[PDB]
Amino acid sequence: NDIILTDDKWLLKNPAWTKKYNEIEQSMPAINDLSQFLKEQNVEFYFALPPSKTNALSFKLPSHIHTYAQENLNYFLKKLPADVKPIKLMEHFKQNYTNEEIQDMYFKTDHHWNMDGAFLGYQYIMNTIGQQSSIYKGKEIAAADYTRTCAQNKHLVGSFNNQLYQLIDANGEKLCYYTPKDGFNFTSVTAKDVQGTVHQNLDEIYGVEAAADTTSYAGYYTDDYPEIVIENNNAQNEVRALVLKDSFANAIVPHLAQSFKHTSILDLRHYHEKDVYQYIQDNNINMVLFVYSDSNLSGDMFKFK
Numbered sequence: 001n002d003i004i005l006t007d008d009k010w011l012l013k014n015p016a017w018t019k020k021y022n023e024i025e026q027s028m029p030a031i032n033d034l035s036q037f038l039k040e041q042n043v044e045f046y047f048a049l050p051p052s053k054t055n056a057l058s059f060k061l062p063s064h065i066h067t068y069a070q071e072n073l074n075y076f077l078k079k080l081p082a083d084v085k086p087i088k089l090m091e092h093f094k095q096n097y098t099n100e101e102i103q104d105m106y107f108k109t110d111h112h113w114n115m116d117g118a119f120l121g122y123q124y125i126m127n128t129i130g131q132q133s134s135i136y137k138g139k140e141i142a143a144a145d146y147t148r149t150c151a152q153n154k155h156l157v158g159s160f161n162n163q164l165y166q167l168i169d170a171n172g173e174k175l176c177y178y179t180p181k182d183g184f185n186f187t188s189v190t191a192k193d194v195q196g197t198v199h200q201n202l203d204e205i206y207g208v209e210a211a212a213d214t215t216s217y218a219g220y221y222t223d224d225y226p227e228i229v230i231e232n233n234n235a236q237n238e239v240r241a242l243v244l245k246d247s248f249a250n251a252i253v254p255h256l257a258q259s260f261k262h263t264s265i266l267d268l269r270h271y272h273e274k275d276v277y278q279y280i281q282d283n284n285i286n287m288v289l290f291v292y293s294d295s296n297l298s299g300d301m302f303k304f305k
């Protein structure tokens, strides 16, 4: 049972009205377990935390009411086993940018970060992994190796559960892509959707409705798939990554996949064929990377067994 806030026509989904320490406690054992298993199997374990829009833009909420996005996140980060390496995106963002600048990294009418936010996120994620990892060597992520292209007056349709929100606002907004100078050249791209249909090639899942004047985040970037598998033989490493994600990862699924030789991308809301432990063993995963919004700290996507 969600709640939506509107204000100067920005849309804010499920602000942190309450502490969720109790919900975090109840889900943390699954992580403790996974963490111990992965440490045994010599598999690196990163937990990237894109800033939820209601954290990054909590300054737009009524000033007479305190919200707890940062407390909840801090609680999660303190209860995390020390062998989980968190990537603290809100902290990085708030350290380098003002509130008004950070607002330019989110869509106004949809509750995800935009491509500029997601890219900066990608950059910090890979930079951190690069400093921590024994198996990941790669070129530092510079904006100069990508070409950024943008359309100016697109209209994002808010989508969450079975709900579509649309804002009549003649301006609309920025829709950007960051594309490698020589394109994404993946050896293969395979994605099973929720109906069981298998799609091949990046073009059938990423930016499929880019030309649309009005559509959802999912249409502009990707939908949520049970499983995407990407083989990248041109990668200068042997990393076989497993990305476990919520929809914040969609905009940067191919940018992440470019870093590693193999990338498996699961959404546990939809992937039910194997559990995570078995998937990791069946596919010789030597690196795990969560990409969960920092408000997605507990609940259904933390069921790994």
Ligand code: NA
Pocket (backbone or CB within 6 Å): 094, 095, 096, 097, 098
């Ligand atoms: Na600053």
